Each structure stands twice: as structure tokens, then as C-alpha cells.
From a paper:
Ferritin from the marine pennate diatom Pseudo-nitzschia multiseries (PmFTN) plays a key role in sustaining growth in iron-limited ocean environments. Typically formed from 24 subunits arranged as a symmetric, hollow sphere, ferritins take up soluble Fe2+ and catalyze its oxidation, with the resulting Fe3+ being stored as an oxy-hydroxide mineral in its central cavity. The di-iron catalytic ferroxidase center of PmFTN (sites A and B) has a nearby third iron site (site C) in an arrangement typically observed in prokaryotic ferritins. Here we demonstrate that Glu-44, a site C ligand, and Glu-130, a residue that bridges iron bound at sites B and C, limit the rate of post-oxidation reorganization of iron coordination and the rate at which Fe3+ exits the ferroxidase center for storage within the mineral core.
Glu-130, a ligand that can coordinate iron at both site B and site C, was substituted with the non-coordinating residue alanine. Two structures were obtained from E130A PmFTN crystals soaked for 5 min (E130A Fe (5 min)) and overnight (E130A Fe (o.n.)) in aerobic Fe2+ solutions, respectively. The structure obtained from E130A Fe (5 min) has iron bound solely in site A (data not shown). Iron was observed bound to site B and site C in E130A PmFTN, showing that Glu-130 is not essential for iron binding at either site. Remarkably, mineralization in the E130A variant occurred more rapidly, with an initial rate of 40 ± 1 μm Fe2+ min−1, ∼10-fold faster than in wild type PmFTN. In ferritins, such as human H-chain, in which the ferroxidase center functions as a gated site for the transfer of iron into the central cavity, the mineralization rate at lower iron loadings can be interpreted as a measure of the flux of Fe3+ through the center to the central cavity. Consistent with this model, partial regeneration of the initial rapid oxidation phase was observed in E130A PmFTN. Thus, Glu-130 plays a key role in regulating the flux of iron through the ferroxidase center, and we propose that it does this by coordinating Fe3+ at site B such that the rate of exit from the ferroxidase center is limited.
Numbering used by the authors:
A (entry chain D), B (entry chain E): 2 to 159
C (entry chain H): 1 to 155
D (entry chain C): 1 to 157
E (entry chain A): 2 to 158
F (entry chain G): 1 to 159
Write the structure that this text describes.
Amino acid sequence: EELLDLFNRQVTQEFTASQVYLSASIWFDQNDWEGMAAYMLAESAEEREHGLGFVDFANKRNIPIELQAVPAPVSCAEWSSPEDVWQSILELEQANTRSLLNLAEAASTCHDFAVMAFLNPFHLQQVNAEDKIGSILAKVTDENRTPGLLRSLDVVSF
Amino acid sequence: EELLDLFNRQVTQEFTASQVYLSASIWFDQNDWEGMAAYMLAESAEEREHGLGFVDFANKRNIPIELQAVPAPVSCAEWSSPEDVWQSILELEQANTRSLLNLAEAASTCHDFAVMAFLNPFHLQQVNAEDKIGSILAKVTDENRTPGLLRSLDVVSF
Amino acid sequence: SEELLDLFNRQVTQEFTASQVYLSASIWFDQNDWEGMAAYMLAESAEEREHGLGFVDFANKRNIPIELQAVPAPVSCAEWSSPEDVWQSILELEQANTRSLLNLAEAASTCHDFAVMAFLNPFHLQQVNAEDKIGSILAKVTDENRTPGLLRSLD
Amino acid sequence: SEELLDLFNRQVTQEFTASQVYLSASIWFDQNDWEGMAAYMLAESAEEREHGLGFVDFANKRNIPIELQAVPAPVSCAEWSSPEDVWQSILELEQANTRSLLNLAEAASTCHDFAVMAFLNPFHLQQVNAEDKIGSILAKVTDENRTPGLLRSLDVV
Amino acid sequence: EELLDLFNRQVTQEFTASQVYLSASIWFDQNDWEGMAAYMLAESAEEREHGLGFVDFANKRNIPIELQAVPAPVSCAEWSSPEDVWQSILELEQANTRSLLNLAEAASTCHDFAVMAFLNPFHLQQVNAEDKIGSILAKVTDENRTPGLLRSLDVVS
Amino acid sequence: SEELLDLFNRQVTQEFTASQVYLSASIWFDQNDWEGMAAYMLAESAEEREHGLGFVDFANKRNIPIELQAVPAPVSCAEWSSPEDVWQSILELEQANTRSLLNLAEAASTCHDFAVMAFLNPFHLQQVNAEDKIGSILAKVTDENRTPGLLRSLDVVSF
Ligand SMILES: [Fe+3]
Ligand SMILES: [Fe+3]
Ligand SMILES: [Fe+3]
Ligand SMILES: [Fe+3]
Ligand SMILES: [Fe+3]
Ligand SMILES: [Fe+3]
């Protein structure tokens, strides 16, 4: 079953994203962006919570879950500035949205109304996540035009 | 794109509805039905809030909103009793409902799960609204069979 | 449209039917001195009645004619002889409850009745939880009843 | 004795029957935009079910075997055309409810079943109150319904 | 009466300004200036409240009100930066002020003391509004001389 | 010190690996209607992840570069068929967690890295408590499961 493999994968995607968020916190912390680091860390925990929510529903609905490996984050090796980090995070959220939409498609094809109902809050959370990340990225990109100015986004606002 | 156009039209319909409700408040106040007036004023505000909720979601989801003219209400030229006003308000809500349904249809066809999730509470609200306005119109039509009687219940209820 | 309106009317019957079966289970348990299991069944009986009354309220608001049907006599109680038999029947009840909701949602879907489908969502998720809760209780009951008297300690 | 046990089972059914009849009254009232009277009937529907539950509880304690019967479909609601028709059916229902409790009490009395007679006492008094209140409402409805629209006033109370 | 047509006009002008504020909110939100967007959204609501205030007064004083179309905001098509938006909003407020002054003019010629009294707080509100928009626009125009810096006005409020 | 810097990195991986193993135990228990044991495992999964994050934080402060590695898929779950099997695996996991900390501490001792040793101290004591508590639960489980049904009683009662 496709629906069931995709549900598994979704758990994996949430934990993958949690680890990518953690990688972002690390790069920020190492480069003394403690505000952006705390934001990424908080998002890491929340992504893990989403994974757990998927796990709990699957268990209730007798969808067998077998935990997969959580792949090592790869984009950190390339990051040179906060702009690069926030852009990777945007891509991560876009990919998170795409995987949920694929899972919803499979559910819709199966007439699985319970799964579709379960996913609705996630669909709306993704809209809010891509908007928030996108907006932060816009701010960072604008402020990084003047040397040192972005270092005030961090200290003040986050 | 059909879903962008319909999403924009939904915004217009909410604000059109807001103005129609305001027109109703005005007719009521000018004819000394202050309770019925207060109710229409409350609704006018709430319809505008729905509109703002659509705009907010559209902004987040990158659906470009271009605000359109809000047309002049016209039913208020033909009103001559409260019954006429409540009947037009029922028909407004029926058109608000139809319009949400067209939107949902477009989103369904596009497999736009986030838009469909967003609309759900509005579908349920429209059930409530058509029911509440139907009920008031029934009461108005019944009480208006005895002279003076309708007036005694603007003054009490509302 | 006719099919959707009659399935909605028959969902009310299903909810009340399930209420009565829960009540039946409560009775068997009380008669056989399982007051803890009887209390649980009595609470679910009230809750299934409330679900019915939710369906009724919604139909009234959406102008779906409701005509209340006979609520059938519960019949599994004639054959229950252990708690296990009762909880197995309640599990079957919930699985049937789930299928009737899914059929209704299937007819709404066909009719493009977005409002009805939205109404049903919380109920689909409630049935997921109900089947899981019942299934778990039955697993426990089945395991504990392997030793004489032990199940009496769960109650 | 057999007859007493029969009648006790029956009473449970009668309570749940009346619960459904009150629900049918709520429905007709809601459908016809009498939300106040519909609220009233809904609350009574709940209450009748609680009475039935109290009989089941007692029977279980006293080892009167109960076996739940079908709850018949309400029938009056097909022919109601105005609130007067509904309140009239509900008065009859309560009148019927009183008769079955009195019959059950007769059977208990013949058996010298003092515990059953004691259990029934608060219900006999509740039935007096119920018939009084329903009768009183029916009287208002029937009076106020002589002026078009005036009964809609009662409902907003 | 010109006095009556101008009073109706004024309602349309308050609602037009509400819609124009809403269009500025949208442009800001779409361009990730969430602080400016919130500010414009609150002003949109307040202009609607002013309109509603004129409507209520007109009803009380038997000034027949007939609601006009609220035209579509047009400046938003050409905005490219926050400076452009704020400049349009200043122009809206200036227009808002002239219209109130024209209404007061008509009221004065008619010796309509009640309308003049009703308008007093709005005249003083407009002085405040022009001053406040003018001051934000001066900050915006100054800060936008250094790339990124304006993005700090938004974030700090 | 590269040995030190690698072992520290590997310790993060070990804490997150343990987090996932505890999640897998939680899942087994839930699937098999042991909701009390499943809650306990879930709690422990969060706690191990917290330890991992504490090691990350200290590394960042101390300029020990952390590069996150793959967190391996739990595999003991395939073999579990009773709660005893699950708790046995979790004992062995903790024993492994203990050995990894001790090896890290050895490396820090060789390097005279007093700050790393001081940092590890609370974890060494936590590991004593952890092994003791899992070992104790495993003893109870093993005893109660000698009578059919009895172990259920103590998922539902206790936990
Ligand atoms: Fe997520
Ligand atoms: Fe609306
Ligand atoms: Fe149910
Ligand atoms: Fe009764
Ligand atoms: Fe103004
Ligand atoms: Fe650890």
C-alpha cells in the first residue's frame, strides 16, 4: 500500500526536517547568531512534535510505522551567511508541504476521509510556515545589504 | 487561473455583503426599528471580518488580491417593511453560500487541500447563517400578521 | 439529493442504535457485578446519544428532513457469557459505526456537499480514537482473563 | 411474580419511548422555527431517558431482569400542523406515562412489594407535576394562538 | 441641498479611505512589511468607524443616506517601495481633510450648528492624522537612504 | 585531540540514536496496547534527545565542531515479541550509552581536558540511575510475566 508507505515517509520527513533545523541552529550558534539559533532550535523541537503526532495517529489507525534512518543534514556544509541558511530552510518547508500534499492525494484517491481530516491542520500550518520563513528570508536579504545591519536583526528582534 | 480569480471574487462578495447589511441597518434605523438595525450592523462588521480573513489567507498563500469596487446596495430602494429587508438578507446569505461552494469546487478540482481546509469553517458558518436568518424571517412574517405586534418584538428581542 | 438525505437520516438511527447497545453492555456488566465496566459502557451510551443529537441539530439547520425510526432491540446480550464477548461486540459496533460514517461521507463527496463533509470530519477522527480505545481494552481483557480472577482486578 | 417483572421491563421501554417522542417534538419545533419550545422538548427528552436509566439501575440492584426492547418510532409528528397539536400530543404522552406508572404500582401493591412501591413514589409525584406543567403550557398556547403572530411571543420567553 | 449631498459624499469618502488603507496593508503584507501592514489594517478599521459615525448621525438628524459604491483602490497598482505607499496615504488624508472642510463650509453657510458641532472632533482628528502620517513618511524617507535600514523600522513596531 | 573531537561528535549521534530506539520501543508498546509502557518510552525518547542537545550546546560553546550524522534506523523492534524483549533491549542500550560516555571521559582524561570531564560528571551519575531503573523495571517485568495476564495489570495500574 502506497498510502501506507507515504504515511511512513511522512514521519521520516518530519524527523529529517527537525534535524535540518537543528543543523541550522548549530551553524548559527557557531557563527554567533544566537537569536536565529534559538529560533531554529525551537523549530527543530516542533517538527519533531509533528512527527510524533503522525506516529500517534498511525498507531491508532493501525498504519504500521517502522522508523527509518534520519539522514544527516547536508546543506550546512555549504552555508556561508544567514541568507544561505534561511534559503535552505525555505526549501525544506516547501518540500515538507509537497510531501504532505502527496500524502493527501493518496488519501483522497483511497477515499480515506479520516486521514484527510487528520492532515487538514497540517496543510494550514504549512501555509503559515512557508509565509513566515519567506518573510524572514526577505528581511534578512534586505538587511544584509548593509554591513553589520543584519547583526541587529538577531540581537534585537529574535 | 480560475482559483485565483474566484478567491478574489470571494473577497468582493464578503465586502458586498458587509455593505448590504449596512444598508439594511440604515433602512431599519430610519424606520425606527433599532433592534433590527443593531443586528444588521453587527452582521455588517462580521461580514467584513470574513473578508479580512480571506485576504489574510490569500496573502500567506501568495494568492494576489486586487481589491475591486464594492457595489452600491440597491435592494434598499424597494424595501417597504421589515419582511422585505430580511427576505433580501436571506437571499444575500444564499448567494454568499453559493459563492463559497464555487470556490470550494475550484479548489477540489485543483486538489488544493489547503484552500479546502481553510474553507471548512466557512461552510459550517454559512449553514448557521442561512438557518438563523430563515428563522428570523419566519418569525417576522408570522408576527407581522397582527398590526403593531412586530414592533413589540424589535423592542424586546434584539 | 435523495440518497444523501436518507443516509443522513439513517446515521441518526445508527447512533441511537449504538447508544442502546452500549446500554445493553452496561446492563450485562451490572447484572454480573462488573460495575467498573458497566460505568464505562453507560458513559459511552450517553455519548453516542449526544452524537445522534448532533446529527439531528445539523440536519435541522441544513433542512435535511429527519424522521426518527425505530431503535432496534440490542440482541448480542443474549449470547454474552464473559466480558470478552461483550467488548468484542462493542468493537464490532464501533467498526460498523465507522463504515456508516464513511459511506455517508462518500455520498456527500459524490454530491460535492462540502458542508456535510466538513461536519463529518470530527466524527471520522472520533471513530479512529474509539476503535483504538476499544481494541486496546479488548486486548487487555483477553490477556488478563487467562488467569482466573485477574480480570476482576481490572474492573 | 411474572406480571410485575414484565411491567417493570415495560416501564423502561415507556420512558425511552417518551424520550423519543419528546425528541420528535423538538425536531418539529426546530424545523418550524420555534427554537424556544424546541429547547424545552430537548431537555425533557434527556430527562425521560434519565428516568428510564433510574428504573434500569433499580431493576439491576433488585435482580429484576431487564432486557431492552426496541424503542418504537414516534408516530404523531407526521400529523402535527401547529404548536397546539404538538403540546396536545405531549400531554397525552404524559397521561399515558402516569397510567403505566400507576399500573406498575398496582402490580407491586398486589405483590406486597414495598421496595418497588417506595421506589415509585417520587415518580408518581413527578408525573403530577409533569401533567400540570404540560397542561398549563397547552392552555397558554391555545389562548395565545387565537391572535396571528402572538404565540411567537411565547417562544422568545 | 448641497449640505445633504456632501454629507453623503463624506460617508463614501470614509469608506473609500478604509479600502485604500486596506490596499496598503495588502501591499505591505505581500512585500513582507508586517509591521506597516498591521498599522494600515488598524487605520482601515478606524476609517470604517468614522464612516459609521457619520451614518449614525445622519440617521438621527434625518439626513437621507444612500450608500454609494466604494471604488477600487488604484494607487496600489503603481507602489514600488514603502515610501510610495506612505506618500499615497498622506495624500488620502489631505483629501480626507479637504472634504471635511468642504462639509463644514456648507454647514456653516446653512447655519447648521448641529452639523458643525458634530464635525469638530473630526477636524481635530485630521490634524492629528496628517501630522502622524507626515512624520512616519519623513522617517521612512530618511531611513530608506541606507539599504536594509528601513526594514528595522518595520521590525521595531 | 582529534580523537576527543570525534568522540564528542559520536556522543551526539549515540544520544539521538538512543532517542530513536526509545521511540521504537514506544511504538511497539502502543501497537501492542501497552500504553503505560509506551508513555514511559516516549518520555525517555525526549529526554535522550535533550541530552544530545546538551552535548551540542557545550560543543558549540567550546569550539568543538559538531557535524550531525545519520541517525540509524532502530532494528531491535523487528525481533520483539513480548515486553520483556523490549525492556532487555533498552537495558542494553543504556549499557551502551554508559560505555560511550566512559570512553569519551577516558579520552578527555588523557588530554587533561578538565572542562570536558566536569561537563560529563552529571551524565555519569545519570547513567548509574538509568541502568538501575531499567534493570529494576526489567526484573519486575520478568517476574510478573510468569503468570498470564499479570503483567497487563501493571502497565495499567502503574506507569
Ligand atoms: Fe512539519
Ligand atoms: Fe460571509
Ligand atoms: Fe457515534
Ligand atoms: Fe418519565
Ligand atoms: Fe476619516
Ligand atoms: Fe543519554
